[PDB]
Amino acid sequence: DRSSSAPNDWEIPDGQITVGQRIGSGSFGTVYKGKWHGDVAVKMPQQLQAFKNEVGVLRKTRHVNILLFMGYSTKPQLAIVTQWCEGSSLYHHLHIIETKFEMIKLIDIARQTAQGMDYLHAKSIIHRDLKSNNIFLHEDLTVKISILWMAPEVIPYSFQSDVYAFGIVLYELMTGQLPPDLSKVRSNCPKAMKRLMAECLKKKRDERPLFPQILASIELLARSRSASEPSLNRA
C-alpha cells in the first residue's frame, strides 16, 4: 500500500462480562456499554419486581431480529445484559441527522418489524411500546426488536394497540419529519405502501391487521431499473 492524499446457559456469572462506560437512558432507566467476548449491552422489592417483570418478558426472546439479550446481573447491582447496538435510534437518524435510507430498506424496515412482532406474538409477547426512539438500526440497517406515539386508547394493550405504533412507523418512514403532518410523505412511495400508512390511521382499533397478514402483505408489496447488457467478461 502507499500513502493517501486529500480527496478534494443464559445466566452469565458476574465478572465475565465487563460493563463499561455509561452511554445514556432508554424508555426508563440507564443503558451502559459493556464487554464480553466482544461488546455487550447492560441495562440497569420495587426494583426487583420491575427487573424480573421486564427481564421475564425480555427473557423469552431468542432470535436474530430482536435486540439480543445475553444475561442478567445481580452484582454489584441488578443488571440486564443484551448485545450492543452501534448507531442511533430511528428518531435520531430521521430527525437529527436526516439519515438517507434506501427505498427498499424503508420497505424492509416494515418487513422486519412484522416478522419480529409475529415471532414475539407466537411466543405471546406483547411489545406495548413501539416507537422511533426505541428502534435502533443495528449495523447495516439490521432491525432489532412514547407520549406522542402511544395510541389514544393505550395512552389495555392488545395486538391492535401495538399495531397502531407500526402504523406510525409507516408515517415516519414516508415523511421523515417531526410532528404528524402526513403531507411530508415521499413522492416515489409505492401506492400500496402509501395506502397502508393511511389504513393504519383508521379510527377502529379492531380493524388493524394481524402480524401474519402484514408479513404476507409485505411479501406481496415488496416486489414493487431496466438497462443495457454489461461489458462481456474478461479475467
Binding site: 414493487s224 431496466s226 447488457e229 454489461p230 461489458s231 467478461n233
Partner: protein
C-alpha cells in the same frame, strides 16, 4: 502488426484510457483482420464504454434543462450530443464497410452490433426516419440467430435482451419485450457451461428486466 495494436488496446482498456483502444482496434479492423470472440470483445467493450459515459452525461445534462444562461444549458447539451453522434457514427461506418462483409456467431454479433450501436444513435434523435433501421438490424439478427445458437447462449440472450429492451426504450411497446423475454427463459433454464456463469447473469438481468416491465 495487429498484435502490436492488440497489446496497446489491452493496455488502454485496463488503464481507463478507452479512447486509445478504439483508434487501435480501428486500425486492426480497417486492415481487414478477422476477429475471434476475445478479439471482437475488446472492440465491443472499447466503444461501449466510450459511448455510455457521454450518453449518461447527456442524460445528466438533458435533465438540468428540465429544471429551467438558459440557452447555454441547451447549447452544452447540443455539444455533447453533437459529439455523441460523431463518436458513434464512426463505428457504424466501420461496421457497414468492414464488419458487415466480415464472414456464424461472427455475423450474429456484428449484426447485433449494428442494431446496438444504431440504438444508441437513434435514441439521441428525425427519429421517425431513423429508428426503423435498428428495428431492421435487430429483426435480421434475431431471425438469423434463432437458428444458429440455443437460447442458453449468452449472445442470443444478450441479443434477445437488447432486442427486447429496444421496443420498450425505442417506442414504449412493452408487449413484445415481455413476451420475448419470457420466451427465452425456459429454454435457457433447461440448460457449453464455461460461459454459462455469464449466461446466468444475463438470465437474471432479463428476469430483473421482466421485473420492471411488469409495471
Amino acid at each position: 502488426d495487429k498484435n502490436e495494436l492488440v497489446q496497446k488496446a489491452k493496455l488502454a482498456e485496463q488503464a481507463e484510457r478507452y479512447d486509445d483502444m478504439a483508434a487501435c482496434m480501428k486500425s486492426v479492423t480497417e486492415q481487414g483482420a478477422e476477429l475471434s470472440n476475445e478479439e471482437r470483445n475488446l472492440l465491443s467493450v472499447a466503444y461501449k464504454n466510450v459511448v455510455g459515459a457521454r450518453r449518461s452525461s447527456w442524460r445528466v445534462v438533458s435533465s438540468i434543462e428540465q429544471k429551467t444562461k438558459q440557452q447555454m444549458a441547451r447549447e452544452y447539451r447540443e455539444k455533447i450530443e453533437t459529439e455523441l453522434r460523431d463518436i458513434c457514427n464512426d463505428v457504424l461506418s466501420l461496421l457497414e464497410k468492414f464488419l458487415i462483409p466480415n464472414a456464424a456467431e461472427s455475423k450474429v454479433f456484428y449484426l447485433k452490433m449494428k442494431g446496438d450501436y444504431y440504438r444508441y444513435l437513434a435514441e439521441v434523435a428525425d427519429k421517425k426516419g431513423i429508428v426503423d433501421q435498428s428495428q431492421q438490424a435487430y429483426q435480421e439478427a434475431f431471425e438469423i440467430s434463432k437458428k444458429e445458437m440455443q437460447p442458453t447462449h449468452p449472445i442470443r440472450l444478450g441479443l434477445a435482451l437488447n432486442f427486447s429492451v429496444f421496443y420498450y426504450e425505442i417506442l414504449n411497446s412493452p408487449e413484445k419485450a415481455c413476451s420475448l423475454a419470457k420466451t427465452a427463459f425456459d429454454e435457457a433454464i433447461a440448460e457449453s457451461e464455461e460461459s454459462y456463469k455469464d449466461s446466468t447473469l444475463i438470465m437474471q438481468l432479463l428476469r430483473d428486466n421482466l421485473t420492471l416491465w411488469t409495471s
